[PDB]
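Why run this: before we spend reagent on co-expression, it is cheaper to look at a predicted model of the complex and decide which construct boundaries make sense. The entries below are exactly what would go into the expression plan.
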Amino acid sequence: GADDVVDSSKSFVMENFSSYHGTKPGYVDSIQKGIQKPKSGTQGNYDDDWKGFYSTDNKYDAAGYSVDNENPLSGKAGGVVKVTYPGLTKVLALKVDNAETIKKELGLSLTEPLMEQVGTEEFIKRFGDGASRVVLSLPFAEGSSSVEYINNWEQAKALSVELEINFETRGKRGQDAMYEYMAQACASCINLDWDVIRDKTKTKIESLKEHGPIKNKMSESPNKTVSEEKAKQYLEEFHQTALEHPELSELKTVTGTNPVFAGANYAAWAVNVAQVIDSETADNLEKTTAALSILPGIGSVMGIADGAVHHNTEEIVAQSIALSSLMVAQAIPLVGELVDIGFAAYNFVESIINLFQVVHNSYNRPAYSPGHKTQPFLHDGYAVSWNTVEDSIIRTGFQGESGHDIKITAENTPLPIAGVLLPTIPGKLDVNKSKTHISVNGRKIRMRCRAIDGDVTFCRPKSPVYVGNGVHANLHVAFHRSSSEKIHSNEISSDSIGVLGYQKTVDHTKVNSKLSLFFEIKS
Amino acid sequence: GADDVVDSSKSFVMENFSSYHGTKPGYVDSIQKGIQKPKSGTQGNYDDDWKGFYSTDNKYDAAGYSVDNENPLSGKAGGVVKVTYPGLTKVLALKVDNAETIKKELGLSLTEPLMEQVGTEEFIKRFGDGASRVVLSLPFAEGSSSVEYINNWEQAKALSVELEINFETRGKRGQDAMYEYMAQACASCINLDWDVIRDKTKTKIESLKEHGPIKNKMSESPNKTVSEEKAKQYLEEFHQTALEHPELSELKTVTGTNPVFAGANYAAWAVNVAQVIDSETADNLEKTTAALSILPGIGSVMGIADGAVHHNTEEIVAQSIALSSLMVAQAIPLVGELVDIGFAAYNFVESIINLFQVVHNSYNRPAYSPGHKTQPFLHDGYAVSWNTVEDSIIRTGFQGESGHDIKITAENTPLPIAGVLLPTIPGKLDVNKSKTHISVNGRKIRMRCRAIDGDVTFCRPKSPVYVGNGVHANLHVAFHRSSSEKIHSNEISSDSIGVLGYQKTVDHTKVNSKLSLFFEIKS
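The model came back. Tokens follow.
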């Protein structure tokens, strides 16, 4: 059936339907001359069925596809253009991205490529609803709410093309223009001025070098290939002295308490960069970014931990980059094979700035924190998550029951699950202790549940529960509602189910390992 | 509709249909006298709709519900009985466990309790297919292939009841009889003789005490409440000396290389037990098990790590328990409040034996290792899993495409994903580099894929990819098949997709962090 592949509710006809298309540097003005099937390259897809012109409803997603093909990581970004179809266009939304199914279910030729058929007058006749052409619609990606439009090459000949943004025209260093534009998406939101950050960093790099204690600490350096332990040892000493510079004061404050921001972590980072950068790499930005991009520990220098980007001012970010640069220049001689002063001060800074932008762009994007939807909560060796997104929703406004599955396991050795704290509201959200249980590798363990303070009922497994490598569990919470009255926000004390792991006397007080699965009340 | 709630393919009529029912100590012979609705207690469920007599097709799952209600953890287990319905019975399998839906969809009275209606002659008339009665069937649990039967209380009056096993009759210590019976499920398989283990342990405990170097090492002990660091310090020294006993030789060999089995871990374990066991607890087995069951680090003493139970002989298990006992007796004075010799040698051993059995029973059960089905692979700070079970199946025997989603994230700071190694078979399993990508918080990153040796193609993201707390990704692999010929096992080199994390020069060689998602070829 056609409804087995077509989502009618999301299909509609629009007049002057437009979208965006990321364009590579070199083609920003030529493409404005009109949309046409390239005579070189895949023409949209490896699969013949899916060849076509691609566009998205989101101009920021389009911007991410404008970077130079030979230098995808650190290359220039071209621009974004808006393409419009004069008259009426039918955006046909697909429930599936499988061409054989679509051709089968829509009763089309299984011999010809789906995208070719889509552009035929008979197809435009069947599903166009009187529109001049059909454009297929699919979810852009998971974790994304944008759509991807697949346009027939012949039909796309009608698109009017007009410039949105030409990044190259902005005249900014690196990919500053692209990321700045992308930052416009979030009006929180990290909108940094990288021109300023670029300038403060260099000022600080040059200043740091002209600093007695610093250039003196450098005097103590082996300046010869020494052991990594002594290399980290020297570097941590260096960092401790470098950080006393009055230009690195704020960072000195902001990095003093969070362990991830430690001097040891900066030293560890410096070392890793030094061990992977060789002459060739150092001289090539793209290759530098490639090398740097696969190293662990960049969060230390970025000031990112526990789900937050801590270094969010141009001043403090420049301080961290500059400090990192100084440290790499020192790490190189101790464990490297090239011109420390060269790479560190230039190709190293250019590249790391690039990686900061990649990461900020991610934290700027809408995402699910741990314990939300199917995102897992990783803690104390455990891994817990709602089995499905529906499981995370506690629906209200009816008399009846509901079940909610929570997947639980641990990374290695056998770790216990002491119980679970469940929310309750008399009548509106009661726990059915009879259908609530925890299955460990298929072993269904029942629960002995006790009410507690704050509209919370603690349930404990009637048999010991351990999870680990090879041993997994599924906590199934069964809620029952005698009242059809809806749950009101005021009645909901805590918005998460709390799975309790092993017991530790942290803070001199017996604290339990806490794993949280966040829910939403709906309907 | 009735097919919106009833799974016909799994519904059938059977003559002399039987199942099992776990029975509590005290009721093994009374219940054999006939099945009848208890006049005390919930009578099957908190929900009126689900009240009924419960049985399972699996006698080993039934055995797990025979333990004493007042002492669920360490209490005696009663037995298991087999109940039979003379004549014809209709086992009606349900696709849903929601009573309101079932009543709605089966067009029943929404006023009366579903389980009551199930036992009415008119209901038995409608869905019994000419059977004398209806018994509802539901999946026993997740990770389990057993079923749960829900019998109407009135109808269950016809059940013939006959003894399967009376654990109490076995005359074994603790819950030895129950776990031994349960071990019969796996004909691998850990079938230990706990009588022997109980005896060797005590022999070793007594012997260990009568050992010069040991009772001399004990002489060096503070025998007074000392600091935990010195307590662990003494204990590790103790362990090192205790382990030189000729009765602990095998264990000495088997625990020398795996870090989890270290002396430090035994010391850490000893300390934690000592800090939670008080007079009351010590004197009560149930309370001892409750306390012990929520402590971390039991895998060390159990010899369980990396998905395997290493201490799998009665001799070596007795050695570890005995060694643990000696160490707790020593840890107590240093960080405790009771009779060390008392608890350690008795209530401590009885309880830990119990926890060994719980854990062995889990590893004896069919389960999914990391990277299989939706079980996550937890490694190097990352967490990866197939989004759904269908995603883990690479179906073969047709020309077309398929998509497979892999969820990726990390526990804290930003960690990179370098690429992914994908399996390929020319024609039968080709990678469509056009539809294969990785979405980070909705940012769809394309891939630049290169063929490699061994029918493996390495794909690298065209933009740097980092994951962590608040940043998550979905790798979508798109496979394409030009040939309808099925993939043969010989053609399949490696059975897993390999996601590569950050790079580390472990073993002096630049090794990448490897995260594996195991697949299955089907159809």
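DSSP finds 16 helices and 25 strands in chain B. Chain B touches chain A through 111 residues (CB under 8 Å). Bring this page to Monday's planning discussion.
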